[PDB]
Amino acid sequence: KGEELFTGVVPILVELDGDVNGHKFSVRGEGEGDATNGKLTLKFICTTGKLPVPWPTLVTTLVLCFARYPDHMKQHDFFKSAMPEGYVQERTISFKDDGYYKTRAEVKFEGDTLVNRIELKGIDFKEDGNILGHKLEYNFNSHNAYITADKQKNGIKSNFKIRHNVEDGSVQLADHYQQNTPIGDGPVLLPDNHYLSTQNALSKDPNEKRDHMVLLVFVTAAGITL
């Protein structure tokens, strides 16, 4: 019955408290999600000043319950099925030849707003690497994220690799491990193997003075026939 909460446009709040090689920061984002179209429209603000990492490295951390699942795949939508109680999403992001992110987030309804509250910790980054050295382009490539059921924990797992464009023409790989577990006790939908096709577009607000990122996302599920 959780899917009924996403038939219209839903406001979103995202809050992230981060710590990368000791550099603390906070990010606040607001916008709306349209699950029927698989669309996200958000604006994120660094409320502590300058962001110590490039904005593209936070995109995957900064609400898969807004993915557009086809009609023949509705029975495989774990993320909506756990709502409104929500789910915990935990990740390890390992940047090739550099440090790693450890994240824990809670995604659930607070009132009528879908809220994603995240804690991030970054360890073992190189000072002149592509991340702390701010050598990544302000863009994003389209990707596919593969979903697998975790029936022993009543949740799901996801694994994928993000390709970050580097300003010198090279590519910075970021390997992603993900696990999700429901917060409540109600029944959830445990899916067969499938993937989420995701596209992102990064831009800036010409009137915004704070360090920020304007983000439009399109997420669609695929990989199951019938």
Tab-separated table of C-alpha atoms in Angstrom:
chain	number	residue	atom	x	y	z
A	1	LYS	CA	0.000	0.000	0.000
A	2	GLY	CA	3.091	2.207	0.188
A	3	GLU	CA	3.008	2.804	-3.573
A	4	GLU	CA	-0.257	4.756	-3.182
A	5	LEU	CA	1.711	7.520	-1.422
A	6	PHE	CA	3.611	8.344	-4.647
A	7	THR	CA	0.795	8.823	-7.180
A	8	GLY	CA	1.289	12.603	-7.156
A	9	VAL	CA	4.094	15.100	-6.678
A	10	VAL	CA	5.772	14.635	-3.285
A	11	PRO	CA	8.007	17.206	-1.547
A	12	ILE	CA	11.492	16.044	-0.571
A	13	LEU	CA	13.916	17.083	2.174
A	14	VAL	CA	17.532	15.853	2.184
A	15	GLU	CA	19.936	16.465	5.079
A	16	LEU	CA	23.521	15.191	5.161
A	17	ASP	CA	26.215	15.493	7.838
A	18	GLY	CA	29.623	14.582	6.440
A	19	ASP	CA	33.239	14.053	7.516
A	20	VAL	CA	35.978	13.526	4.902
A	21	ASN	CA	39.571	13.299	6.191
A	22	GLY	CA	38.427	15.443	9.120
A	23	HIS	CA	36.751	18.123	6.970
A	24	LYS	CA	33.223	18.427	8.367
A	25	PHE	CA	30.320	19.811	6.347
A	26	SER	CA	26.536	19.833	6.060
A	27	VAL	CA	24.288	19.720	2.987
A	28	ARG	CA	20.581	20.594	2.876
A	29	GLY	CA	18.437	19.856	-0.163
A	30	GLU	CA	14.809	20.490	-1.026
A	31	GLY	CA	12.597	19.747	-4.005
A	32	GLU	CA	9.918	17.400	-5.268
A	33	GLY	CA	9.701	13.873	-6.639
A	34	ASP	CA	7.356	12.515	-9.319
A	35	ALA	CA	7.490	8.710	-9.164
A	36	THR	CA	5.032	8.274	-12.043
A	37	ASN	CA	7.586	9.992	-14.289
A	38	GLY	CA	10.640	8.834	-12.324
A	39	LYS	CA	11.701	12.476	-11.993
A	40	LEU	CA	13.536	14.304	-9.213
A	41	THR	CA	14.087	18.079	-9.121
A	42	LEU	CA	16.209	19.279	-6.209
A	43	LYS	CA	18.546	22.044	-5.071
A	44	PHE	CA	21.280	21.246	-2.542
A	45	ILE	CA	23.048	23.856	-0.402
A	46	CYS	CA	26.245	23.467	1.612
A	47	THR	CA	25.175	25.167	4.848
A	48	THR	CA	28.688	25.191	6.377
A	49	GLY	CA	30.528	27.142	3.675
A	50	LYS	CA	32.687	25.551	0.991
A	51	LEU	CA	32.177	21.878	0.174
A	52	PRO	CA	35.450	19.979	0.816
A	53	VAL	CA	34.660	17.366	-1.876
A	54	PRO	CA	33.371	17.679	-5.451
A	55	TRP	CA	29.591	17.793	-5.783
A	56	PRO	CA	29.425	14.778	-8.182
A	57	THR	CA	30.844	12.486	-5.473
A	58	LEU	CA	27.729	13.126	-3.338
A	59	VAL	CA	25.090	12.567	-6.046
A	60	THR	CA	24.480	8.875	-5.332
A	61	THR	CA	24.353	9.533	-1.581
A	62	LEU	CA	21.973	12.503	-1.898
A	63	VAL	CA	15.726	8.442	-2.712
A	64	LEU	CA	15.055	5.453	-4.968
A	65	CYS	CA	11.380	5.295	-3.925
A	66	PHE	CA	10.787	7.778	-6.779
A	67	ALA	CA	11.936	5.362	-9.496
A	68	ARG	CA	9.439	4.722	-12.300
A	69	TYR	CA	8.585	1.015	-12.145
A	70	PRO	CA	6.733	-0.297	-15.228
A	71	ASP	CA	3.275	-1.766	-14.722
A	72	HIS	CA	4.570	-5.317	-15.221
A	73	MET	CA	7.273	-4.712	-12.573
A	74	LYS	CA	5.124	-3.224	-9.777
A	75	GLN	CA	5.543	-6.349	-7.628
A	76	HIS	CA	9.331	-5.715	-7.537
A	77	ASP	CA	9.302	-2.170	-6.056
A	78	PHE	CA	10.833	-2.681	-2.614
A	79	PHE	CA	11.444	1.017	-1.952
A	80	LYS	CA	7.813	2.161	-2.134
A	81	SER	CA	6.602	-0.961	-0.309
A	82	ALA	CA	8.452	0.001	2.900
A	83	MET	CA	6.736	3.427	3.074
A	84	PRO	CA	5.669	5.371	5.078
A	85	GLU	CA	7.738	3.660	7.803
A	86	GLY	CA	10.745	3.742	5.486
A	87	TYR	CA	14.032	1.912	5.164
A	88	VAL	CA	17.680	2.215	6.173
A	89	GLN	CA	20.162	2.577	3.307
A	90	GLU	CA	23.843	1.860	3.993
A	91	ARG	CA	26.702	2.190	1.526
A	92	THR	CA	30.437	1.826	1.067
A	93	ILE	CA	31.814	3.867	-1.847
A	94	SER	CA	35.412	2.954	-2.747
A	95	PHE	CA	37.129	5.439	-5.062
A	96	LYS	CA	39.760	3.618	-7.117
A	97	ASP	CA	43.313	4.416	-5.952
A	98	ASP	CA	41.904	6.778	-3.299
A	99	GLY	CA	39.759	6.839	-0.161
A	100	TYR	CA	36.287	5.538	0.591
A	101	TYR	CA	32.926	6.813	1.823
A	102	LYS	CA	30.833	5.098	4.497
A	103	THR	CA	27.220	6.273	4.636
A	104	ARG	CA	24.091	5.457	6.615
A	105	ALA	CA	20.757	7.042	5.732
A	106	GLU	CA	17.134	6.820	6.836
A	107	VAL	CA	14.498	7.405	4.149
A	108	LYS	CA	10.936	7.810	5.416
A	109	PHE	CA	7.928	10.103	5.513
A	110	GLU	CA	7.962	12.961	8.028
A	111	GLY	CA	4.472	14.379	7.744
A	112	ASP	CA	3.797	14.614	4.011
A	113	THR	CA	7.473	15.061	3.060
A	114	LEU	CA	9.835	12.292	1.980
A	115	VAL	CA	12.950	12.887	4.096
A	116	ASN	CA	16.427	11.433	3.496
A	117	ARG	CA	18.708	11.956	6.517
A	118	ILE	CA	22.308	10.873	5.904
A	119	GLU	CA	25.539	10.551	7.870
A	120	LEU	CA	28.731	10.314	5.791
A	121	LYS	CA	32.321	9.537	6.800
A	122	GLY	CA	35.279	9.658	4.391
A	123	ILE	CA	38.623	8.041	5.181
A	124	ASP	CA	42.043	7.572	3.536
A	125	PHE	CA	41.726	10.181	0.778
A	126	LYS	CA	44.854	11.580	-0.867
A	127	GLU	CA	45.356	15.330	-0.550
A	128	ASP	CA	46.317	15.680	-4.230
A	129	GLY	CA	43.936	12.997	-5.486
A	130	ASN	CA	41.001	13.626	-7.789
A	131	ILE	CA	38.572	14.137	-4.877
A	132	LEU	CA	40.396	16.326	-2.354
A	133	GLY	CA	42.222	17.977	-5.262
A	134	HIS	CA	38.896	18.947	-6.893
A	135	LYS	CA	39.892	17.542	-10.289
A	136	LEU	CA	36.480	16.171	-11.335
A	137	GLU	CA	34.272	17.760	-13.971
A	138	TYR	CA	30.906	19.181	-12.897
A	139	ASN	CA	28.830	16.621	-14.774
A	140	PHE	CA	27.576	13.052	-14.556
A	141	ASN	CA	27.276	9.992	-16.771
A	142	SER	CA	24.231	7.763	-17.102
A	143	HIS	CA	24.459	4.447	-15.262
A	144	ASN	CA	22.597	1.244	-14.429
A	145	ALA	CA	22.286	0.047	-10.819
A	146	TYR	CA	21.545	-3.658	-10.341
A	147	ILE	CA	19.115	-4.666	-7.571
A	148	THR	CA	19.103	-8.040	-5.800
A	149	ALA	CA	16.812	-9.288	-3.035
A	150	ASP	CA	18.237	-9.975	0.447
A	151	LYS	CA	15.499	-12.266	1.731
A	152	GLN	CA	17.326	-13.216	4.936
A	153	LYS	CA	17.191	-9.543	6.016
A	154	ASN	CA	13.831	-8.739	4.353
A	155	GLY	CA	15.619	-6.159	2.189
A	156	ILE	CA	17.685	-5.604	-0.968
A	157	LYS	CA	21.290	-5.194	-2.083
A	158	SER	CA	22.758	-3.132	-4.901
A	159	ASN	CA	26.195	-3.021	-6.522
A	160	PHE	CA	27.484	-0.768	-9.296
A	161	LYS	CA	30.437	1.337	-10.442
A	162	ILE	CA	30.205	5.090	-11.099
A	163	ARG	CA	32.443	6.692	-13.745
A	164	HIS	CA	33.453	10.234	-12.743
A	165	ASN	CA	34.901	12.374	-15.528
A	166	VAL	CA	38.279	13.925	-14.686
A	167	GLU	CA	39.239	17.302	-16.132
A	168	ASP	CA	42.404	15.827	-17.701
A	169	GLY	CA	40.381	13.391	-19.833
A	170	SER	CA	40.766	10.367	-17.547
A	171	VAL	CA	38.035	8.630	-15.528
A	172	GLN	CA	37.776	8.185	-11.744
A	173	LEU	CA	35.973	4.955	-10.837
A	174	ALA	CA	33.832	4.744	-7.695
A	175	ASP	CA	32.690	1.261	-6.693
A	176	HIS	CA	29.389	1.187	-4.785
A	177	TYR	CA	28.125	-1.377	-2.276
A	178	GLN	CA	24.589	-0.917	-0.963
A	179	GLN	CA	22.185	-2.659	1.413
A	180	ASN	CA	18.638	-1.660	2.392
A	181	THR	CA	16.506	-2.933	5.280
A	182	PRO	CA	12.975	-1.857	6.243
A	183	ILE	CA	12.464	0.233	9.359
A	184	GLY	CA	8.949	-1.001	10.129
A	185	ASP	CA	7.485	-4.477	10.487
A	186	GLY	CA	4.884	-4.421	7.701
A	187	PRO	CA	5.178	-6.684	4.664
A	188	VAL	CA	7.529	-5.564	1.904
A	189	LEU	CA	8.010	-6.518	-1.735
A	190	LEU	CA	11.154	-8.616	-2.257
A	191	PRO	CA	12.115	-8.349	-5.937
A	192	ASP	CA	13.610	-10.584	-8.552
A	193	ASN	CA	16.898	-9.470	-10.112
A	194	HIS	CA	16.589	-6.231	-12.096
A	195	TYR	CA	18.277	-2.871	-12.578
A	196	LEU	CA	17.560	0.851	-12.365
A	197	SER	CA	18.526	3.046	-15.322
A	198	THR	CA	19.566	6.439	-13.932
A	199	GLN	CA	20.380	9.738	-15.644
A	200	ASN	CA	21.465	12.968	-13.949
A	201	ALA	CA	21.881	16.589	-15.039
A	202	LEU	CA	23.917	18.997	-12.905
A	203	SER	CA	23.550	22.771	-13.196
A	204	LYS	CA	23.886	25.974	-11.178
A	205	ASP	CA	21.494	28.654	-9.960
A	206	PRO	CA	22.773	31.967	-11.415
A	207	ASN	CA	21.401	33.858	-8.376
A	208	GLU	CA	22.615	31.506	-5.608
A	209	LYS	CA	25.630	32.779	-3.656
A	210	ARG	CA	26.230	29.690	-1.503
A	211	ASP	CA	28.062	26.609	-2.760
A	212	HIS	CA	25.255	24.575	-4.289
A	213	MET	CA	24.128	22.033	-6.874
A	214	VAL	CA	20.918	21.984	-8.920
A	215	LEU	CA	20.031	18.395	-9.787
A	216	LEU	CA	17.495	16.784	-12.111
A	217	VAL	CA	17.281	12.981	-11.930
A	218	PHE	CA	15.487	10.352	-14.021
A	219	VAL	CA	15.291	6.818	-12.593
A	220	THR	CA	13.492	3.973	-14.373
A	221	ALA	CA	13.352	0.261	-13.577
A	222	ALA	CA	13.973	-2.392	-16.227
A	223	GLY	CA	15.265	-5.931	-16.713
A	224	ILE	CA	12.117	-8.009	-16.148
A	225	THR	CA	9.917	-9.268	-18.984
A	226	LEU	CA	6.338	-10.751	-19.063
